[PDB]
RNA sequence: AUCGAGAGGA
């Protein structure tokens, strides 16, 4: 996370060579999409990054106290004084080709958080394991090597598709499944099967 | 094979319609009075100002893949500067006897209008445009 | 409800998901350890024994592999222990629990599943790393992002189970949905943004690039098309190579605003056979729209061909995009020196316009609009003068954004963002509201205790003269906070309400199905409709068509 | 840096959470629902501090 | 009994997506379990692809029993059902 | 209101009309008023339309009203689905709500009405009236672990 | 001399700044990628901890030792362990380092890479000498010790490349720029008013002719002449970073020429 | 938690500059900007490396055992 | 047979409006060969367009209504500016309708 | 931790809305989403 | 010495509060266009003044840099996540024994701060890094 | 933990060999070569250079997935010219430019002081 | 192992 409710997860890692690069030869620890900017209206994230860039140049204390007299204009002036296009843009080269990117890139430092929720404490896969005592059903929870709930709400999607065999199979072969003996007259499980 | 049309047009207007490398041009021939032409030109490659008497042609010739020119020993119907390749896509009739065709050069558009374009510009996915001087 | 209508299941798997442009629409990237956990039982045929005896040997630990070999006599053999695990002679008719391999049919589901499209069969593609990977275009039917959403996967254990998966549930043949007689999938985010950028009449690409792009399409027949420009320097248009991705016999026609077969704004769309004639490709063309390219390609050429079409339009545009680049800065929210002054003197008029009405009402010369209170009409007037104020200020700022403005490019492309967003970022956030009314007197006869009593002005009751760029004032900050909370509240309340509505609808129609005489019935055999939907027709094989006999003059009909 | 304010019960550090409740000994009137005979009501919840 | 003679049968002559998905499914089970094959397997080894081929050439010896909401039924050979779809 | 209506020449033209808009409902009193069109008067309370104009006009307003929730919102959903909902709420004679009072009171199978709400008492009176359960409901086969008579299992396969 | 053309404008032990003309854009870049990621170096790749009563975690320290730059001068005469026929490692392929320090004084005790002691036979070559560019003689503070705290460990530095782990890179940052005035229209300036006044002219504008508005766009002109600056981290002297750069790239082209032959 | 070796983003060694930086600040009473400049940290990524850094190791060392 | 004529009525209006003599020859200039081909698709595609016996339409419909429901916003509205345009819309309206609620928030006559 | 120790809870007519009187007393931003939103507060 | 006072909502009912000493009372006697637009004096009968408007925020929302430039629900989201961020929860952590402890290798104080951090011990115990971010469509990953 | 090993970006696994050459089934006189454990460093360099040779009808390359090191290069040439010879010349050309770039740099370097 | 409770994820 950034600190403006910009959540979201790593999709891939490029080594420094495949990354886009500035002319001074700086390179991003991180690339985020211009596409998670304008619906969320998180201009503070934009302002941080612009501001933060000037801190890092001047060696100063980026002051982002809410109700103060700091302005995107004010910042920008300070930023152009240090020798960079005042709105945080910067010509970059594609790292595959060396070729200058047609588009300039907003590029600057920005405080980012590493949250809990890492993949390898979620990856869970069962293919038969321990069963509950009462219901002879798969046990609950990853931490115990359990099944995933095929809910009644999912059972609906399966009906819409017309997948009858697959629905019967999820609900018999996987999970439950049991043979019993039925009275042909009474219709109850009264039959004592002295089987074998 | 072979030519399909010809005339020297006189450019009446050059408009940069919200673009940087392209312009829609307005012209009419000087030789013939009931004839007019509108055209998208790449104005980075071949610059055109107002009243720039251009010469214009169509062909269908000088299909497999396009091989790079390698014009060490080559010959194309180009004595010309600007040259495009496109598709006919509407042959319109402006009634009684007037006719107009529409061409697309992968998006760069052309509209020509006369009459003696008669037994000429058929339904062909052909047509090259050629402009000089 | 908890152990019969639905139950916990074997052979099902779960992880964080991630998008992958180089992945097929109907594929699903399965992390490899999962792929080593989940198994298919497979009978031993002379057709498979060379793949199976091999696969047995690989054992449970190396990928393309197996645990457990079941013989007749019911008895299992555990390929992780057992002394004979590098021995073993497979008989015909034995089962081998093999690992899941490339191109196995698997059910893939994201919750809440409320939808047939929340449950689709994918083709397996075993991969490194611990995320499921999916094509961005299968994003929507699932309604998933990549901000830490998580999906399930259930593996079919039987032969016709997998048949039933790949013949009914497969992704390709869910592209066009009975919900709305329209495709439920389309081009989104980067690709949707880039495909616009690519298709501009200004966009030309020269040989080097063109060859790699061509090559990027896996269906490409190895024929460089002739460049639109062959004069000083062979150049191709963006439109030209994109068209390589669009199949043959594909016709499409639009017309938007000032569209005149000569598109002097390059809008509308004409595609004449696999080739685009004029008009920028965006959302109405290549979104999940009604008479769109996807709708047409699915219908005309088949789901299989249409599925690959996503694949291709991505591979190219994504490639083009990578090498062009696209960004968005805070510079993209700064209007105009002069424009700022306008916006200011525009709010300012709506300020005095409210003054006056107030001044009017205070002097008892305000008349009540039929059927409403004196004070109700005042609120109405004021709230209106202020919405107009915001919307007019917003359009002043939108007009002033250049075509090179990145925000405006995502709006035009239909990829992300609206007018309201431009508005609030750079002109004026506007009136705040709770309970459908402007801010309430919470403290007695005032909204905050920094105000006097009986103050009805804009700022006193929630109008926020400023924009996210200029920054909120203390008061404004608080009011907007109050408004925001109200939004969070009923989002939490909506999902509760609608989750229940859905259940009841589902539970109340459950057994209604079309019988073998086109009559619509339930379990009881009660006729509900006599011919489904009143016409016997399936909802997916329908499109909006124009009834020519209806409109126009009696002369024009006759002629 | 530890601020304190928490307990420790069986070596598990516990926080007591503040509880929101309505104040007693204040008198308040409440217009009542239209399908009922009582038009208005005044209420006091009186307790010893 | 009950039944319905091959004449006066009112249900679609065409196969339904559900009829064919089960047919392929059913045959795919038999092929997968070493039961004999009635087509020239042009190098196909997949039991379902093989059932798809045997379908395309209408050499699958199955019959659909279509039920009607009254209880009566119509029989159709896989041979006689059109497989457009 | 705007209203499109056939010109004397054939084509539809914009011909604007005065429309009265009310707070509250007394239908069979206001339609019988002199001066208005009794043929086009409408009320959102479809539960009144049902009462004055009978069950079918009911069905029609109910649909018009459900449709209006979707469309006003900005969404479109094909007619055959709302039609089916509306029909189901209406083939019983009056209005049956999608509620443990409406549809679930119907005399479908006990096993399938119990899986919705009021699980246990639906199963008590089921033992008390000695109900016969059809086993044609999807849910009853779900519960029994059999193949529902659904899409794939809607028919039979035979040699 | 025949080919691609180089000209230095500045040099130090740490930076070389050069114009690079008569070359293909694809080569200039390919060279930088290799220069960043592919030239062999020596760095620590095994730590065996005997005692760590420090404030820091074992693998935290082990990580820090990886990143410590070591002399990689004579690297070309040392093998990859994956290759070398020894079991595990020898002096023919790996270099063994030691580290001990105990908390001696009242005051905090510092631990610097200068404290690492080579123990392998070096067989007289320029390898493994924790690079110190420090002014006061001790480079890279590994960790700090209190009063009675101790750290005793054993490192093994091996031959590797950035592609494996970024520790193995002699790279630092590589400045790279062509066509400072955008005569090639490779970029499209984002602006509010006026491009030139808004974007700062790069230092490399003095080295090219002004674009001149009175001239049509040159459409044949190609990416050629590239302003670069290569910075070295320490393990290899700058010049050598570019040279083994040019070289490893030449070597890997050839490995293909070769591969065409065998098959 | 000790000065990291090597700037994350670029790879320049900064792990040997913590001492000097603390001295350029205290002893010569300099400001972090010209401090960083004098230590040869020009690119703003390496500049952030030292300017951000919080030296918690001091507080860890303060625990007796 | 009567039900069958009806089922099709609306499609035939489209069919005749399109495949009418003047049009078939003047607007889109078909030849005897192309024309039979057109009559041949129109049939095939029509049969391919029919609903399949077996289709679970019950569940399909529920999900086709509940799903866009879950995407609805403003259980107030933007009608809000007007203090009387308060016609119960969105989800609380669905709640009334599906509940057949006797006491609705905004009853209204519209009189023509 | 600092957050947790300054938390409010509220059992069970508009208890979730940020009421005007909160100003200065209870943070206007910090509250959990969904479930029990606007019932749990921080100082 | 009666320079400062305590107040509860009830009393709040009967007082007029200023927002800033200066911009809310120096009198009356040009403007910067970049600055956020002010309300007024417009009431000259004050009893109290805010110590500072930013103190309306809790502990979590105090870390958000420029919250007054954010759409409010986001601000709520960030306060949900500030709690979930790895950092350094205590110094004595190598001495405690509790299920689950997550520490950042190289915590950084952030480059843009708030005056409220100073009292929240955030630059002494940060959770986060200054990552050089780039906003761009690259690979499409 | 599901991460592949880092050396698999450069080390050839067993079996796997550096080049595999395939006859193209689309256009005549064209070939497609897969390069194990390579990337844009090499693909983009060969391609751009294979394009200077005027007997090369077509030349392009592409890393189909960034997880793996393999990339594909497709070449087409004029009748008479073998695609493998075009590659060969392409390599040699590069190698000579590089032995040039190298001697030129060394000469420069030595002339510098400081 | 189960019952409850609480925290938190989409
Ligand atoms: O037609 C639409 C409507 C919304 N959005 C996006 C806009 C914004 O990025 C997001 C906000 O909607 P919401 O808050 O409901 O969902 P979310 O933002 O995706 O968050 P989450 O997935 O946690 O519910 O959805 C679209 O892209 N297209
Ligand atoms: Mg979203
Ligand atoms: Mg999510
Ligand atoms: Zn060795
Ligand atoms: Zn750096």
Nearest nucleotide, C1' to the C-alpha of C150? M10
From the CA of C492, which ligand is nearest?
Answer: 1
Q: Which of residues 147-176 of A touch strand M (CB under 7 A)?
A: none
- Please, which residues 255-274 of chain C have a Cβ atom closer than 8 Å to chain B? 261-266, 270, 272
Q: What angle do CA F1, F2, F4 make, to 5 degrees?
A: 140
Question: Which is it for strands C95-99 and F4-6: parallel, antiparallel or unpaired?
Answer: unpaired
Residue H7, annotated ligand binder? Answer: yes
**Cβ–Cβ contact H56 with G under 8 A:** no
- Superfamily of domain C175-327 in CATH is RNA polymerase Rpb1, domain 3 (1.10.274.100)
Q: Contact, C47 vs E47, CB < 8 A?
A: yes
Q: What is the distance in A from the centroid of ligand 4 to the CA of K128?
A: 42
Q: Contact, F84 vs F92, CB < 8 A?
A: no
Q: At what angle do helices I57-70 and C474-509 cross, to 10 degrees?
A: 170
State the Cα–Cα distance between residues C200 and C240, nearest whole angstrom.
11
CATH topology of domain C11-37+101-174: Barwin-like endoglucanases (2.40.40)
Ligand 1 atom having least distance to the Cα of C143: 22
State the Cα–Cα distance between residues I22 and B62, nearest whole angstrom.
43
A45 burial level (CB within 10 Å; 0-12, 13-18, 19+): buried
State the Cα–Cα distance between residues F58 and L37, nearest whole angstrom.
72
**Cβ–Cβ contact F115 with I under 8 A:** no
State the Cα–Cα distance between residues G145 and H62, nearest whole angstrom.
10
CA nearest ligand 1 atom 22, residue: C145
Whether ligand 1 lies within 6 angstroms of the CB of A33 is answered as no
Return the partners of chain K (3 or more C-beta pairs < 8 Å): A, C, D, G, H, J
Identify the closest residue of chain C to K38 by CA–CA distance.
C473
* Domain segments of chain L as ranges: 1-114
CA nearest ligand 1 atom 19, residue: C145
Residue H27, annotated ligand binder? Answer: no
Q: Report the b/e string of C243-255 with b at 16+ CB within 10 A.
A: bbbbbeebebebe
On chain A, the residues whose CB falls within 8 A of the CB of G178 are 100
On chain G, the residues whose CB falls within 8 A of the CB of K94 are 55
Nearest chain F CA: its distance from E41 CA (Å): 23
* Domain segments of chain H as ranges: 1-65
Cα dihedral sign for G180, G181, G186, G187?
positive
Q: For chain H, state the CA radius of gyration.
A: 13
Q: For chain I, state the CA radius of gyration.
A: 24
Q: Contact, G238 vs G11, CB < 8 A?
A: yes
Nearest chain F CA: its distance from I36 CA (Å): 32
Give the 3-state secondary structure of residue G229: strand
CA nearest ligand 1 atom 4, residue: A39
Beta bridge partners of B41: B23
Give me the CA A134–C1' M3 separation in Å, rounded.
14
Identify the closest residue of chain A to H48 by CA–CA distance.
A56
Q: First vs last Cα of chain D: how many Å apart?
A: 36
A117 touches strand M (CB under 7 A): yes
State the Cα–Cα distance between residues L47 and L75, nearest whole angstrom.
9
Looking at chain J, how many residues does it have?
43
What are the structure tokens assigned to F102, written together? 């409406």
The residue written with tokens 């290798």 in the block is: K105
Q: Please name the residue ranges forming H helices in C363-467.
A: 374-400, 406-413, 419-422
Give me the CA C117–C1' M9 separation in Å, rounded.
23
What are the structure tokens assigned to E38, written together? 């009635």
Q: Contact, J8 vs J40, CB < 8 A?
A: yes
Q: Please name the residue ranges forming H helices in F31-130.
A: 46-73, 79-88, 110-114, 121-128
On chain C, the residues whose CB falls within 8 A of the CB of I109 are none
State the Cα–Cα distance between residues G140 and G134, nearest whole angstrom.
8
The residue written with tokens 């792990």 in the block is: H15
Q: Report the b/e string of K39-75 with b at 16+ CB within 10 A.
A: beeebeeeebebeebbebbbbbbbbbbbbbbbbbbbb
Q: If we measure between CA atoms, which residue out of C102, K131, G38, C168 comes closest to residue A165?
A: C168
Q: If we measure between CA atoms, which residue out of E75, E78, E55 comes closest to residue E11?
A: E75
Q: Contact, C255 vs C385, CB < 8 A?
A: no
Q: If we measure between CA atoms, which residue out of C169, C181, C294, C183 comes closest to residue C537?
A: C181
Domain H1-65, architecture per CATH: Orthogonal Bundle (1.10)
CA nearest ligand 1 atom 27, residue: C416
Q: Contact, K34 vs C466, CB < 8 A?
A: no
Domain L1-114: assigned CATH number:
3.30.1360.10
Q: Contact, C286 vs C312, CB < 8 A?
A: no
Task: List, in sequence order, every beta strand (DSSP E) within G119-173.
Answer: 141-145, 150-160
C16 touches strand M (CB under 7 A): no
Q: Please name the residue ranges forming H helices in H1-65.
A: 18-26, 32-38, 44-51, 57-60
G1-40+167-263 sits in which CATH class?
alpha beta
DSSP per-residue string spanning A127-140: SS--B-TTT--BPS
**Cβ–Cβ contact K116 with A under 8 A:** yes
CATH topology of domain C328-473: Topoisomerase I; Chain A, domain 4 (1.10.132)
Q: Please name the residue ranges forming H helices in F3-45.
A: 27-30
Nearest chain K CA: its distance from D10 CA (Å): 12
Q: Contact, C28 vs C108, CB < 8 A?
A: yes
- Please, which residues 111-130 of chain K have a Cβ atom closer than 8 Å to chain D? 121, 124-125
Contacts of K76 (CB under 8 A, 6+ apart): A5, C484, C485, C488, J29, J30, J31, J33
Q: Report the b/e string of C502-521 with b at 16+ CB within 10 A.
A: bbbbbbbbbbbbbbbbbbbb
Question: Which is it for strands G109-112 and G41-52: parallel, antiparallel or unpaired?
Answer: unpaired
Give the 3-state secondary structure of residue K115: helix
Q: Contact, K95 vs K105, CB < 8 A?
A: no
Is I53 close to E16, i.e. CB distance below 8 A? yes
Nearest chain A CA: its distance from I100 CA (Å): 25
Q: Which residues of L touch C (CB under 8 A)?
A: 1-4, 24, 26-27, 30, 47-48, 51, 58-62, 64-67, 74, 76
Q: Contact, G78 vs G43, CB < 8 A?
A: no
Q: If we measure between CA atoms, which residue out of A147, A144, A163 comes closest to residue A155?
A: A163
- Please, which residues 171-190 of chain A have a Cβ atom closer than 8 Å to chain E? none
Identify the closest residue of chain E to A161 by CA–CA distance.
E18
Resolution (A): 2.9
What are the structure tokens assigned to G81, written together? 């362990």
How far out from the chain centre does Cα I71 lie?
Answer: 20
Identify the closest residue of chain F to I76 by CA–CA distance.
F73
From the CA of A40, which ligand is nearest?
Answer: 1
State the Cα–Cα distance between residues I31 and I25, nearest whole angstrom.
8
Is L40 close to A120, i.e. CB distance below 8 A? no
| Total of domains in chain B | 1
DSSP per-residue string spanning K77-90: HHHHHGGGB-B-S-
K138 burial level (CB within 10 Å; 0-12, 13-18, 19+): buried
Residue H46, annotated ligand binder? Answer: yes
Q: If we measure between CA atoms, which residue out of C143, C139, C83, C70 comes closest to residue C111?
A: C143
Q: If we measure between CA atoms, which residue out of G89, G87, G88 comes closest to residue G78?
A: G89
Q: For chain G, state the CA radius of gyration.
A: 24
What are the structure tokens assigned to F85, written together? 């909902």
Q: Which of C137, C142, C145, C490 to mutate to test the pocket of ligand 1 (most atoms within 8 A of CB)?
A: C145
Query: Dihedrals φ, ψ of K130, to 5°?
Result: -75, 85
From the candidates F44, F53, F102, which should be mutated to test the interface with I, based on the most I CB atoms within 10 A? F44
K99 touches strand M (CB under 7 A): no
Ligand 1 atom having least distance to the Cα of C145: 22
CB-CB: which of I56, I62, I63 is closest to A162?
Answer: I56
State the Cα–Cα distance between residues H16 and G262, nearest whole angstrom.
50
Is C485 close to J31, i.e. CB distance below 8 A? yes
As a 3-state breakdown, chain J gives helix, strand, coil percent values, each rounded to 5, of: 15, 15, 70
Whole-number Cα distances in Å, L31 to B88, C223, L23, L83? 35, 14, 5, 7
Query: Dihedrals φ, ψ of B108, to 5°?
Result: -75, 115
Q: If we measure between CA atoms, which residue out of C207, C23, C228 comes closest to residue L60?
A: C207
State the Cα–Cα distance between residues L70 and C486, nearest whole angstrom.
53
Whether ligand 1 lies within 6 angstroms of the CB of C495 is answered as no
The residue written with tokens 């500072």 in the block is: K52
Nearest chain G CA: its distance from A57 CA (Å): 16
State the Cα–Cα distance between residues G24 and L35, nearest whole angstrom.
22
From the CA of G79, which ligand is nearest?
Answer: 4
On chain E, the residues whose CB falls within 8 A of the CB of I47 are 14, 84
State the Cα–Cα distance between residues A62 and K111, nearest whole angstrom.
6
DSSP per-residue string spanning G67-95: TS----TTGGGS--TTTSSSSS--TTTEE
What are the structure tokens assigned to C64, written together? 């393309």
Nearest nucleotide, C1' to the C-alpha of A141? M1
Beta bridge partners of G16: G11, G230
What are the structure tokens assigned to C413, written together? 């492309």
What are the structure tokens assigned to D33, written together? 């629902």
Beta bridge partners of B23: B41
- Superfamily of domain G41-166 in CATH is DNA-directed RNA polymerase, insert domain (2.170.120.12)
Give me the CA G62–C1' M9 separation in Å, rounded.
34
Whole-number Cα distances in Å, A38 to A70, C194, C403, C487? 22, 17, 16, 19
Give the 3-state secondary structure of residue K50: coil
A131-196 sits in which CATH class?
alpha beta
Contacts of C423 (CB under 8 A, 6+ apart): C390, C391, C393, C394, C397, C398, C430, C467
**Cβ–Cβ contact K39 with C under 8 A:** yes
Q: Contact, G15 vs G231, CB < 8 A?
A: yes
Whether ligand 1 lies within 6 angstroms of the CB of C273 is answered as no
Whole-number Cα distances in Å, K100 to A116, J5, K86, K89? 11, 20, 12, 12
Give me the CA B101–C1' M3 separation in Å, rounded.
83
- What is the experimental method? X-ray
State the Cα–Cα distance between residues A94 and D1, nearest whole angstrom.
46
A133 touches strand M (CB under 7 A): yes
Q: Contact, C543 vs F76, CB < 8 A?
A: no
State the Cα–Cα distance between residues C323 and C321, nearest whole angstrom.
5
**Cβ–Cβ contact A159 with F under 8 A:** yes
């Amino acid at each position: 996370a950034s600190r403006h409710g910009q959540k979201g997860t790593i999709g891939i890692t490029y080594r420094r060579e495949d990354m886009p690069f500035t002319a001074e030869g700086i390179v991003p620890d991180l690339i985020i999409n211009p596409h998670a900017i304008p619906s969320r209206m998180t201009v503070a994230h934009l302002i941080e990054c612009l501001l933060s860039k000037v801190a890092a140049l001047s060696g100063n204390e980026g002051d982002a106290s809410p109700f103060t007299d700091i302005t995107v204009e004010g910042i920008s002036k300070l930023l152009r004084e240090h020798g960079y296009q005042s709105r945080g843009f910067e010509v970059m080269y594609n790292g595959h080709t060396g070729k200058k990117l047609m588009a300039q890139i907003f590029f600057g430092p920005t405080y980012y958080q590493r949250l809990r929720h890492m993949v390898d404490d979620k990856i869970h896969a069962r293919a038969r394991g321990p069963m509950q005592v009462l219901t002879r059903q798969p046990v609950e929870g990853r931490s115990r090597d359990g099944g995933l709930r095929f809910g009644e709400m999912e059972r609906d999607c399966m009906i819409a598709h017309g997948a009858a065999s697959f629905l019967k199979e999820r609900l018999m072969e996987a999970s439950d499944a049991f043979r019993v003996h039925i009275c042909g007259i009474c219709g109850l499980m009264t039959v004592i099967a002295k089987l074998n | 094979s072979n030519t399909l049309f010809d005339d020297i047009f006189q450019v009446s207007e050059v408009d940069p319609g919200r673009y940087n490398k392209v312009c829609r041009i307005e012209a009419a021939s000087t030789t013939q009075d009931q004839c007019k032409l509108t055209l998208d030109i790449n104005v980075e490659l071949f610059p055109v100002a107002a009243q720039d008497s251009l010469t214009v042609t169509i062909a269908s010739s000088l299909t497999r893949s396009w091989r790079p020119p390698q014009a060490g020993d080559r010959s194309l119907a180009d004595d010309y500067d600007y040259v495009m390749y496109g598709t006919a896509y509407k042959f319109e009739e402006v009634s009684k006897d007037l006719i107009a065709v529409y061409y697309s050069f992968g998006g760069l558009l052309m509209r020509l209008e006369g009459n003696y374009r008669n037994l000429n510009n058929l339904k062909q996915e052909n047509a090259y445009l050629l402009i000089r001087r | 409800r908890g152990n019969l209508m639905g139950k916990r299941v074997d052979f099902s798997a779960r992880t964080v998901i991630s998008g992958d442009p180089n992945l097929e629409l109907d594929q699903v990237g399965v992390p490899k350890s999962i792929a080593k956990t989940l198994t298919y039982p497979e009978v031993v045929t002379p057709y498979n024994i060379d793949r199976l005896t091999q696969l047995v040997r690989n054992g449970p630990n190396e990928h393309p592999g197996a645990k457990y070999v079941i013989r007749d006599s019911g008895d299992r053999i555990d390929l992780r222990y057992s002394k004979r695990a590098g021995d073993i002679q497979l008989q015909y008719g034995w089962k081998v629990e093999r690992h899941i391999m490339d191109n196995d049919p698997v059910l893939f589901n994201r919750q809440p599943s409320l939808h047939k499209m929340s449950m689709m069969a994918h083709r397996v593609k075993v991969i490194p790393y611990s995320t499921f990977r999916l094509n961005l275009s299968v994003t929507s039917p699932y309604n998933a992002d990549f901000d830490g959403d998580e999906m399930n996967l259930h593996v079919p254990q039987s032969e016709e189970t997998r048949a039933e998966l790949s013949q009914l549930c497969a992704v390709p043949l869910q592209i066009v949905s009975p919900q709305s007689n329209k495709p439920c999938m389309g081009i989104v985010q980067d690709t949707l943004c880039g495909i616009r950028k690519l298709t501009l009449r200004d966009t030309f690409i020269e040989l080097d690039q063109v060859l790699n792009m061509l090559y990027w399409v896996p269906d490409w027949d190895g024929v460089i098309p002739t460049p639109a420009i062959i004069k000083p320097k062979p150049l191709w248009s963006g439109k030209q190579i994109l068209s390589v991705a669009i199949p043959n016999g594909i016709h499409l026609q639009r017309f938007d605003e000032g569209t005149t077969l000569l598109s002097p704004k390059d809008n509308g769309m004409l595609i004449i056979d696999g080739q685009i004639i004029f008009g920028v490709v965006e959302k109405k063309t290549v979104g999940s729209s009604n008479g769109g390219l996807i709708h047409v390609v699915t219908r005309e050429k088949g789901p299989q061909v249409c599925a690959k079409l996503f694949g291709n339009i991505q591979k190219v545009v994504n490639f083009w995009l990578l090498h062009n680049g696209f960004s968005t800065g805070i510079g993209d929210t700064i209007a105009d020196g002069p424009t700022m002054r306008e916006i200011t003197e525009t709010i300012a008029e709506a300020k005095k316009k409210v003054l006056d009405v107030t001044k009017e009402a205070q002097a008892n010369l305000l008349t009540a609009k039929h059927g409403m209170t004196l004070r109700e009409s005042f609120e109405d007037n004021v709230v209106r003068f202020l919405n107009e104020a915001r919307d007019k200020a917003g359009r002043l700022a939108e007009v002033n954004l250049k075509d090179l403005n990145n925000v405006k490019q995502m709006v035009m492309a239909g990829s992300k963002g609206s007018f309201i967003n431009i508005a609030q970022m750079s002109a004026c956030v506007g009136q705040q509201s709770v309970e459908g009314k402007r801010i309430a007197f919470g403290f007695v006869d005032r909204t905050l205790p920094h105000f006097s009593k009986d103050d009805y002005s804009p700022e006193s009751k929630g109008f926020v003269e400023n924009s996210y760029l200029r920054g909120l004032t203390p008061q404004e900050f608080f009011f907007h906070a109050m408004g925001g909370r109200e939004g969070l509240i009923d989002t939490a309340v909506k999902t509760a309400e609608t989750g229940y509505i859905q259940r009841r609808l589902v539970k109340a129609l459950e057994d209604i199905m079309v019988h073998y005489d086109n009559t619509t019935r339930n379990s009881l055999g009660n006729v509900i409709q006599f011919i489904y939907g009143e016409d016997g027709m399936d909802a997916a094989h329908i499109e909006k068509q124009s009834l020519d006999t209806i409109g126009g003059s009696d002369a024009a009909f006759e002629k | 840096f530890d601020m304190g304010g928490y307990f420790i019960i069986n070596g598990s550090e516990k926080v007591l959470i503040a509880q929101e409740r309505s104040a007693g000994n204040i008198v308040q009137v409440f217009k009542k629902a239209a399908p009922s005979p009582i038009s208005h009501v005044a209420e006091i919840r009186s307790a010893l501090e | 009994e009950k039944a319905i003679p091959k004449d006066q049968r009112a249900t679609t002559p065409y196969m339904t997506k559900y009829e064919r998905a089960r047919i392929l499914g059913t045959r795919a089970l038999q092929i997968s379990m070493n039961a004999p094959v009635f087509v020239d397997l042009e190098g196909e080894t997949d039991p379902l692809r093989i059932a798809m081929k045997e379908l395309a050439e209408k050499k699958i010896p199955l019959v659909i029993r279509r039920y009607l909401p009254d209880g009566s039924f119509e029989d159709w050979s896989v041979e006689e059902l059109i497989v457009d779809l | 209101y705007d209203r499109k209506v056939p010109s004397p020449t054939g084509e539809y033209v914009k011909e604007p009309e005065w429309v009265l808009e009310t707070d509250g409902v007394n239908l069979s009193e206001v339609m019988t008023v002199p001066g208005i069109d009794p043929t086009r008067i409408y009320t959102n309370s479809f539960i009144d339309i049902m009462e004055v104009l009978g069950i079918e006009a009911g069905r029609a307003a109910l649909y018009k009203e459900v449709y209006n929730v979707i469309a006003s919102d900005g969404s479109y959903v094909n007619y055959r689905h709302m039609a089916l909902l509306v029909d189901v709420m209406t083939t019983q004679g009056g209005l049956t709500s999608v509620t443990r009072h409406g549809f679930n009171r119907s005399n479908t199978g006990a096993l399938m009405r119990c899986s919705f709400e009021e699980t246990v008492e639906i199963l008590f009176e089921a033992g008390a009236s000695a109900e016969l359960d059809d086993c044609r409901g999807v849910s009853e086969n779900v519960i029994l672990g059999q193949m529902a008579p659904i899409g794939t299992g809607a028919f039979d396969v035979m040699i | 001399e025949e080919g691609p053309q180089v000209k230095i404008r500045e040099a130090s032990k740490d930076n070389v700044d050069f114009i690079l003309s008569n070359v293909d854009l694809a080569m200039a870049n390919s060279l930088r990628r290799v220069m960043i990621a592919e030239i062999p170096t020596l760095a620590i790749d095994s730590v065996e901890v005997e005692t760590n009563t420090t404030v820091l975690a074992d693998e935290f320290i082990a990580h820090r030792l990886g990143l410590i730059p070591l002399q990689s001068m004579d690297i070309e005469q040392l093998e990859y362990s994956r290759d070398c026929f020894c079991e595990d490692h020898c002096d023919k392929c790996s270099v063994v380092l030691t580290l001990q320090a105990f908390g001696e004084s009242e005051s905090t005790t510092n631990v610097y890479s200068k404290d690492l002691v080579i123990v392998s036979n070096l067989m007289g070559r320029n390898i493994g000498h924790p690079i110190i560019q420090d002014k006061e003689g001790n480079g890279v503070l590994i960790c700090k010790l209190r009063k009675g705290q101790e750290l005793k460990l054993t490192c093994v530095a091996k031959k590797g490349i950035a592609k494996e782990h970024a520790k193995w890179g002699p790279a630092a940052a590589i400045e790279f720029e062509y066509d400072p005035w955008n005569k090639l229209k490779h970029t499209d300036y984002w602006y509010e008013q006026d491009s030139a006044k808004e974007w700062p002219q790069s230092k490399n504008c003095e080295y090219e002719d002004p674009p001149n508005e009175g001239d049509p766009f040159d459409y044949k002109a190609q990416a050629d002449t590239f302003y670069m600056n290569v910075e070295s981290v320490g393990s290899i002297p700058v010049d050598q970073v570019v040279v083994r750069g040019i070289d490893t790239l030449q070597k890997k082209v050839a490995s293909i020429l070769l591969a065409l032959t065998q098959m | 938690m000790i000065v990291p070796v090597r700037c994350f983003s670029c790879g320049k060694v900064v792990g040997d500059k913590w001492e000097s930086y603390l001295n350029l600040l205290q002893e010569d009473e300099l400001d972090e900007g010209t401090a960083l400049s004098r230590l040869g940290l020009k690119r703003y990524c390496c500049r952030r490396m030292i300017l951000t850094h919080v030296d918690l190791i001091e507080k860890f060392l303060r625990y007796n055992p | 047979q009567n039900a069958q004529r009806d089922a099709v009525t609306l499609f035939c209006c489209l069919l005749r409006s399109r495949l009418a003599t003047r049009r078939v020859l003047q607007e889109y200039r078909l030849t005897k060969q192309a024309f039979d081909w057109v009559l041949s698709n129109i049939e095939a595609q029509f049969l391919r367009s029919v609903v399949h016996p077996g289709e679970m339409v019950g569940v399909l419909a529920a999900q086709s209504i509940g799903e866009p429901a879950t995407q609805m916003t403003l259980n107030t509205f933007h009608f809000a500016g007007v203090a009387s345009k308060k016609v119960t819309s969105g989800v609380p309206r669905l709640k009334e309708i599906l509940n057949v609620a006797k006491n609705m928030k905004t009853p209204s006559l519209t009189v023509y | 931790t600092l957050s947790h120790l300054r938390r409010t809870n509220t059992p069970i007519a508009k208890p979730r809305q940020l009421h005007n009187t909160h100003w200065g007393l209870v943070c206007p931003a910090e509250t959990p989403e969904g479930q029990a939103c606007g019932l749990v507060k921080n100082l | 010495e009666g320079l400062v006072e305590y107040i509860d909502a009830e009393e709040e009912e009967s007082i007029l509060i200023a927002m800033q000493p200066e911009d809310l009372e120096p009198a009356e006697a040009d403007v910067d266009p970049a600055k956020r637009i002010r309300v007024s004096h417009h009431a000259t009968t004050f009893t109290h003044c805010e110590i500072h408007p930013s103190m309306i925020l809790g502990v979590a929302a105090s870390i958000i840099p420029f919250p007054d430039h954010n759409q409010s629900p986001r601000n709520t989201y960030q306060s949900a996540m500030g709690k979930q961020a790895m950092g350094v929860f205590l110094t004595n952590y190598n001495v405690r024994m509790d299920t689950m402890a997550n520490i950042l290798y190289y915590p950084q104080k952030p480059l843009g701060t708030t005056r409220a951090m100073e009292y929240l011990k955030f630059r002494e115990l940060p959770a986060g890094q200054n990552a050089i971010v780039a906003i761009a469509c690259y690979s499409g990953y | 933990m599901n991460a592949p090993d880092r050396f698999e970006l450069f080390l050839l696994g067993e079996g796997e060999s550096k080049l595999k050459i395939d006859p193209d089934t689309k256009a005549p006189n064209a070939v497609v070569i897969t390069f194990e454990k390579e990337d844009h460093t090499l693909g983009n360099l060969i391609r751009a250079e294979l394009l200077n040779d005027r007997k090369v009808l077509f030349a392009a390359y592409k890393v189909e997935h960034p997880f793996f090191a393999r990339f594909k290069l497709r070449i087409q040439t004029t009748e008479g010219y073998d695609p493998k010879d075009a590659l060969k010349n392409a390599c040699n050309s590069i190698i000579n430019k590089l032995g040039a770039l190298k001697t030129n740099f060394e000469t420069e370097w030595n002339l510098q002081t400081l």
